Symmetry: D2
Subunit: 255 residues, 4 copies
C-alpha cells in the first residue's frame, strides 16, 4: 500500500524488461525511495536511462557482483552510509551457462552446477546477512523463483536445482531472521519475456502453454510481479514469512 518514507534495495535490473524494473515501477509509484544494484556497466547506463521514467529524485546506484563477498559487504555498507536504514531487499538475480540450459541435465558440469548455485541461491544468504545490518527494527526480503524449482521442467535443468536450493534458502533464512523481525519470502513468477529468458531452451513453447492451460488463460507481466512484491515488502504481509507466492495465472495449481 503506501510506502512513503520506506527505502528498498532492488538488485538485478539489466534493462526495461527486467522483472526488477517491474518491481521498481510499482514501488516508485507507491512513494518508496529506491536503491539499485547492478553487475555490469551496461546495466548501469541502462538504469540511468530507465530512472528518467521514475519519480526518484536521485540516482542511488551501486555495483555489486554477488560472486564477491567483498562487493556485497562493501556495497551494503555504503548504501547504509548514503541512505540510512532500509526496509527491505528485492533480489532478482540468477545465472547459469547457456550450454547447461538445454539438452541433457545429466551432462551438467560441476563448474556450471556450482556457478548457478553461487549466483542464484547462495547470493541470497550473503545479501540477507549484510542487509540485516541495515534493518535493526526489521524488514522484508523477497527473492524471485520459478516453478522449475518445484517440478522438473524440460530445459530448465541446472537452474531448476538452483531454484530449489533458493526456495529452501528462503525458508532457512525466514527461520533464522524471524526473531529479528525480518521476513523472507519468494515470488514464483510465471514465464516473462526478459533478457535472461533468451537463454532458456523452449521458452516460447512454454509461454503458449500458459495461455492455453493456465486458469487465467493468459500470461503475467513484470508489473504483476511488482504488485505482489509491494505486498510482500510492506506491512500488508506482516504475518507472512517463509512463503512462496506464485504469480503465474494459476499454472502452479493445475496438472
Amino acid at each position: 500500500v503506501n510506502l512513503e518514507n520506506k527505502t528498498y534495495v532492488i538488485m538485478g535490473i539489466a534493462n526495461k524488461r527486467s522483472i526488477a524494473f517491474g518491481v521498481a515501477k510499482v514501488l516508485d509509484q507507491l512513494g518508496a525511495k529506491l536503491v539499485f544494484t547492478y553487475r555490469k556497466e551496461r546495466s548501469r547506463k541502462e538504469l540511468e536511462k530507465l530512472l528518467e521514467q521514475l519519480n526518484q529524485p536521485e540516482a542511488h546506484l551501486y555495483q555489486i557482483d554477488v560472486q564477491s563477498d567483498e562487493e556485497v559487504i562493501n556495497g551494503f555498507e555504503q548504501i547504509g552510509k548514503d541512505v540510512g536504514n532500509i526496509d527491505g531487499v528485492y533480489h532478482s538475480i540468477a545465472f547459469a551457462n547457456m550450454e547447461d540450459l538445454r539438452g541433457r541435465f545429466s551432462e551438467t558440469s560441476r563448474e556450471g552446477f556450482l556457478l548457478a548455485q553461487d549466483i542464484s541461491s547462495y547470493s541470497l544468504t550473503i545479501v540477507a546477512h549484510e542487509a540485516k545490518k541495515l534493518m535493526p527494527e526489521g524488514g522484508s526480503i523477497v527473492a524471485t523463483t520459478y516453478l522449475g524449482g518445484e517440478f522438473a521442467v524440460q530445459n530448465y535443468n541446472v537452474m531448476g536445482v538452483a531454484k530449489a536450493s533458493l526456495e529452501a534458502n528462503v525458508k532457512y533464512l525466514a527461520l533464522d531472521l524471524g526473531p529479528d523481525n525480518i521476513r523472507v519470502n519468494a515470488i514464483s513468477a510465471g514465464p516473462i519475456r526478459t533478457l535472461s529468458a533468451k537463454g532458456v531452451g523452449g521458452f516460447n513453447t512454454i509461454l503458449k502453454e500458459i495461455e492455453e492451460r493456465a486458469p487465467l488463460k493468459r500470461n503475467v507481466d513484470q508489473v504483476e510481479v511488482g504488485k505482489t512484491a509491494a505486498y510482500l515488502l510492506s506491512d500488508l504481509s506482516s504475518g507472512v514469512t517463509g512463503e512462496n507466492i506464485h504469480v503465474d495465472s494459476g499454472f502452479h495449481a493445475i496438472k
Copy 2:
C-alpha cells in the same frame, strides 16, 4: 490497495473475535462498501453492534445458512438487487461437531464427517456459483483454511479432512472460473482465539508452540489475516489464483 467503489461480501462474522471481522475492519479502512451474511440471530445482533465501529454508511445484512441451497441462491440474488455487482467474497465459514475435534479420528461418524464437508467445503462451491452471477467483469474469492488441511495435526481430526477438501475446492474453482476472470484463493491462518477455537482440543498448547517454534516467535491476529485478504481481494494480487497464502508467522515452513 485503495478499495473505494469496491463492494465485497463477507460471510461468517459471529462476534468481534471472528477472523472475518478482522477482514471487515481492514476492508472498511480501505474504503470498501461491505455486505455481511450470518447464520444465527445472535450473530446478526453482534453485527449490528459491530457496524458502529466501521465506516459503513449502510447496514447490509443477509441471513444465509450455507446448508441451504435456497438460502445461498436467494441471498446473493437479494444482494445483487440491493447493491448491484460485487467485486469479491470473503468466506469465513466452517463447522464440525465438538466430539470430532478431540480423540480418535478413526471413530468419526459418517454424519459428522459429511456435516463438516457440507458447511466447511461444499459451501464455497455453491457460494462461488451464485456470486459469479454478480461478477460479470471478474472478481476475487478467498476462503479461510488451516495447516491441518495439509498435514495431520492432533485433535483437528474431521476438520483437517474438510480443510483438505476446501483447499482442493479452491484449486478446482480457480481452474473453472479463471476464464471468467474470477480468481479464487485461500488464506491459511495460524491459530487465533475465536468462538470456534473453543471447540478444538489442545488449542492453547498449539498457540504456545507457535510462540516458541515459528520463525516470527509470536502468534498472528485477525487484522493480519484481514491485510492479506485485502491484497487477495484487490488488483494487487492480479496474477494470483489457486494459491494458499499462510498467515501463520512462518510455521508452515518449519518442522
Copy 3:
C-alpha cells in the same frame, strides 16, 4: 516380498480391468490368503470367474456397500469369524455421478459432492475402524488415489476434491492408528483403462499426454499398482506411513 501366512482384504474389484485385480494377482502370486468385497451382484459374478486365475484355494467373498455402516461393520465381523485376524486392507473404491466428471466444477450439486465424499473418502475411515479390530498386532491399510487430489485436473472435478479429502484421511488415520502399529498409505495411480475411467471426460487425451510427457514416456498398468501395493502391505515398508506413492511413470514430478 514373501507373503505366506498373511491375509488381506481387497475391496473394489468389479472386473478383470479393476486396479484392485492387479493388486489381487500380485498378492496371490506372493502366497497371501485373500478376502474380497464387492457392491454389485455383477462384481461378485466376475470375482467368482476371476478366482479361477488365482491360486486361492477358497473363495471368501463379502458384499459390502461402504455407504452402509451396518454392512461395513457386519462384513468385517463376518470376515473375522471366517478367516481370523487379517494383516491389511487394500481399498480401491470411489464413485461420483458421471455428469460431475466433465464440464464446470462450479455447477456441482450438493448431493453429488457429498456422495463422492461419502463413498470415496469417508468409506476409508469406517473401513479402518472396523478392520482395526482384526489387526490386534498391527497391519497395513492402502487406498487408491489420483494426482487430481493434489492439483486441479480439467474434468476430474468433484472427484479431485474427494481425492484431496481421501489423501488427508490417509494422513489423519496414519497419525491415529500408528500407535496401534497400523500403517495407512495411498498409491497415486496414473491413468489406467478401467470401467470407472469410462466416466471421466477427456481420459484418452490424458493417456496420450502421459506417453508424450511423463519421464518414463509410457502409461502404467494395474499390476504395477499391485507391486507397489505388495511393498506397502508387507514388512518391506515397515517404516512408512502417511505416505502417498505415485505409480505414474514420474508424471507427478514434472510440469
Copy 4:
C-alpha cells in the same frame, strides 16, 4: 523381491552404523552382487571387516571421492570392467563442515555452502551420468535425503539447502533418464544414530521428538531404509520415478 543375478553399486559406507550398510545387509540377504565405493582409507578398512558378515563371495571395493570428476569417471569405468553391467546405484553421500550444522544459517560461508552442494547434490548428477554407461537396458538410482530439504529444521542449516538441491536433482534426473528406462528416486530417512549424525546440532532432541510425536511413536533404523531401498532398486517399483519416499515413522505427514 528376489535379487539374484542383480548387481548394485553402494556408495557411502563408513562403518557398521552407516545407512548404506543397512541397504547392503538387505540387498545381500536378497541375493544381489554388491560393489562398494568409499572415500577414506578407514572406510575401506571397515568395509573389509563388514564384508565378513555378508554373503558376498568377493570384495569389490573402489575408492571414489565424489569431488573429483576423474575418480567418479574412472571408478565406474573400472567397476564395469570388473563386474560388467549393473542394475542400480544407492547413493548415501553427503558432507558439510560442522560449524554449518548449528547456530545461524545466515552466517554460512560461500565456501561451506558450495562444499555441501558439491558433495551432497552435484555428486548424484555425475554419478548418474557415469553409472548410466553401465545400465544399457535400464536400472534404478536411489539417493538418501532428509525432511530438512523440504522444511527449515533448526540446526540442519546448510545441509537443508543441499538436500532441497538433491531432491530437485532427483526429479531432473528422473525426467532426463526416464526415456533410457533409468528410474531415479530418493529416500527421506528419519534420524538415525550414525557417524555423520554426530556433527549435527540438536540431533538427540529430535530423535526424542520423533518417539513422542511421529505416528509410529518410534524411530526408524538403517535396515528399514534398506528394505525401502530394495523396493526402489527392484522391479517392484517399476512405475515409480522422481519420487521421495519418507521412511520416518510418519513424521513428514504431521504438524
